[PDB]
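Continuing from yesterday's entry. The apo prediction looked reasonable, so today I'm repeating it with flavin mononucleotide included to see how the binding region is handled. Same sequence as before; SMILES copied from the compound registry.
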Amino acid sequence: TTLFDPIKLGDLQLPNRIIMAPLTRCRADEGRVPNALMAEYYVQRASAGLILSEATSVSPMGVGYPDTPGIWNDEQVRGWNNVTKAVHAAGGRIFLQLWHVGRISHPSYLNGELPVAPSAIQPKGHVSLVRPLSDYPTPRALETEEINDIVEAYRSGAENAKAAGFDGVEIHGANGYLLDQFLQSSTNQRTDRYGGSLENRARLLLEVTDAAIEVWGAQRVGVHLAPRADAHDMGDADRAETFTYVARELGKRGIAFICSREREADDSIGPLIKEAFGGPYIVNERFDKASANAALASGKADAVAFGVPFIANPDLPARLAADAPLNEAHPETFYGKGPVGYIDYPRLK
Ligand SMILES: Cc1cc2nc3c(=O)[nH]c(=O)nc-3n(C[C@H](O)[C@H](O)[C@H](O)COP(=O)(O)O)c2cc1C
Ligand SMILES: Cc1c([N+](=O)[O-])cc([N+](=O)[O-])cc1[N+](=O)[O-]
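Holo prediction written out below.
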């Protein structure tokens, strides 16, 4: 098996195993509404086996960056519908990544309110993009009932994604955002049904997953994880146990895939997760053509997601097939505004 062999995820046939990783780019219109610029960008990348969209918030309290899109209202659904129609006409496939940033936010995005979280534990560091430099606030610990409200927002978010014509949704369970905050022991000190045991810590992620399953069918839902717990001040007392529990439970549900941001190293627990899950496993982080093909050949992966290389290379699959040069990425325009560093990376000549 190579990157260029087709794969099915659930009942969706992909033409290859080169996946576009989810990538926040902050190019949405005011009101967090997807636009024609975003449609153009995704269409340029439609040769990807599957596109995983930029993280998209399921409620106004789940945002923490400027100009990132939402999926909670009709205006946003309409904007996304133009994206998915254009991707589909271009012969591509796309899933919406459902987001809630939890404590990784700033009151300036939340009309002065505090970011919410499983527990009132301040994340270290500075808020990305915010100027002048600012620490994160200490978040407000959610009430038990408010967590059910969040589940309902993911449910409505998944329904809205379906109305917007996506091929499926991916739950953002990774990178220290809300669901990950609940999942891990350092950030979750709750003593209700949502903390204080592994079953309880994983509960919110599985409840959101089940809601998405009611709307889509499990074979059109994926989940994103970050098993090294290395972004946004995370940490868990037994991550081998925590992430394989999740993998096992998601596998029981027959979900379409798990995608893990976890570069290859001796301590990679990807193989334990893959085995416990039993379905298609998408690896990610610092892979290139050679190491991706090696992972497919060894059975460590069923497909491989590329992030920065897809930012810089709209026709990454053709470039990889041809062992062609790759455009150099410009991290200074990963975020920010407009078409420069967004839709102006050239295709192969
Ligand atoms: C600019 C940028 C935006 C990203 N946005 C998201 C995101 O919205 N959701 C997510 O799960 N990961 C996001 N990531 C992480 C990537 O999906 C991926 O895990 C990471 O870039 C490593 O893979 P790579 O080495 O192939 O780039 C982002 C990464 C970058 C550089
Ligand atoms: C490394 C990283 C993030 N971070 O700030 O540490 C955030 C991401 N995100 O989803 O916004 C993704 C990241 N990543 O996967 O490289």
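Comparison notes:
- The chain is about 30% helix and 15% strand.
- The longest helix spans residues 144-163.
Will overlay with the apo model tomorrow.
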